[model samples]
Target: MNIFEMLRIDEGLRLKIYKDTEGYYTIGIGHLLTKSPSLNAAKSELDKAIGRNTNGVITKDEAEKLFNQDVDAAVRGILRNAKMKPVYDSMDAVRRAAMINMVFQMGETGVAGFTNSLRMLQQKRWDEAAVNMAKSRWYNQTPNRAKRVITTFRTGTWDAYK
Candidate 1:
């Protein structure tokens, strides 16, 4: 239950699950999906992309499992990003993992677009890097999300989204 993130993104408006005109099942205001779209039924969200996979929130245990998968995906991105910038590997696990959270969402390359931020991170200036993110247009585009990433970058702790 520890996810130190920057943004205060809020959810829980009622796990609204619906389908599109095409009758595609979906959740929230996102892509279409289908609950148990998988031939085997229980499949990681990775299967839901092409479409289908929205059984809706079942249990806290399910959320727990999805949490692990999300973190795993984040870690994978961190690893690949480390390959691009070896310095990325030198940070604390918490710092690195927080970064993975952001990098996974946009790909390390996306984060790199923040020239000053990337430079600061490459220079091991975690503080400056965090500030750079704060001053970034990203913050303006999605204030909550940017704040969460900034928090993660600064605190190196995973703050669960409430």
Candidate 2:
């Protein structure tokens, strides 16, 4: 399966504005509008692009476009980062995509904080890396998503889930 399809399951599609667990105004596929410097300006620009008028609604196609952009950003952010690039390049495509998905859900800094886990990954210690990933607060908070990623790292396969 494609990495995009994998993320669709990881970050479910939401066509309307909703408050995330942290009470952030989120839309599309986990797009946190709250992360924007100006929520109003961001919303307005998104509305203009999606042809909506603050109605808290968007089409699946629009959401997909935004999701793709976010995915691209995550990919580039990791691929270009001095500290992240080597760790990323040490993995196969499936493992790399799983890492990119983690970078998508949490920013690069968040993923970078997994020092031990990333070290294990870079050393090709897949099982140890999986254990390190599971032994984290992120695993507790998002068990299912974290499991999928961990499974990918452990097995280096796309068959973790659909």
Candidate 3:
């Protein structure tokens, strides 16, 4: 199965599901499956955001219009952050989804703070990557959640949950 499917996403339904659920779009953590948005609106907003259309991620008014909240600035802030950009670029689809989950949990600055983890990822050190992933304020802050996602990164699969 493709990454989206592995994440339980119906085909072509990721963005919609994500936004509707208020899916966390942060850099490093996993999304809480419990918190999702309406399927249709989330899809449309995601299309707009990823497409960078006037109605997409760039337009604050559009986001506020869609989400019923003034979240345009926050969305833009996430898109603009340097650290998240690399994670966005480097990971495969499933891993990318996992990272976005992390980002949502961690916030832009919190996710960006993983200098050592990012370095390990850049070096392609798989085991080190997993170890580094666990060594975060987040780990101490939320051990259960941190263990779940970091295991995903290390094994390239969702083994932690099992």
Candidate 4:
């Protein structure tokens, strides 16, 4: 299975704006509207992304477009972050998906902060990488999702896919 399939499982699909677990304004499958410079900016972006005026709702097609854009931004951020690119390049596709999944939930800077864990991943130390990942606030905050991504790293497989 592809990363998008894995992402759908993790993020879920949403056609309307709502609050995320962190209570930030969000929409379109975990897209954080709070990232916008201001509430007005966020609203304007939402309207443009949805291609019309919105009453805090969007179409599936619009949601899909936003999801794609978010994933692309995450990937690019990972690639551009100095601490991330080399390790990202060293991984196989499955492991890469795990990184992408983590980056999607948390920004590249957040993932990059996993210094020792990134080193373990870069060195192909699967067990160490998983262990390191598990021992984080990120994992503590979102145990189920973190466990799934950690398992992906440990096993190098998309066993979370069905």
Q: Over all chains combined, what TM-score does candidate 4 have?
A: 0.92
Superposed Cα deviation of residue 109, candidate 2 (Å): 1.4
Q: Which of the numbered candidates is closest to the native, going by highest TM-score?
A: 4
- Give lDDT tens digits, candidate 4, residues 70-158: 88998898888888999999999998988998999988778878999999988999998888889899999989999989999999988
Cα lDDT computed for each candidate against the true fold:
0.53, 0.84, 0.51, 0.86
Question: Which candidate model has the greater TM-score, 1 or 2?
Answer: 2
Better of 2 and 3 by lDDT: 2
Model 3, 1-162: lDDT tens per residue? 433333332112222233322343311012222333444454454565445433322343433243322123334554687766665567665566566556544556777788778777656676898887776667886677677677767777765544
Give the winner by lDDT: 1 or 4. Answer: 4
Question: lDDT ranking from best to worst?
Answer: 4, 2, 1, 3
Pairs clashing within candidate 4 = none
Candidates 2 and 3, the one with greater TM-score? 2
lDDT of 1 at 152: 64
Global fold similarity of model 2 (TM-score): 0.89
For model 2, the run of ten residues with the poorest summed lDDT: 33-42
Candidate 1 C-alpha error for residue 118, in Å: 2.3
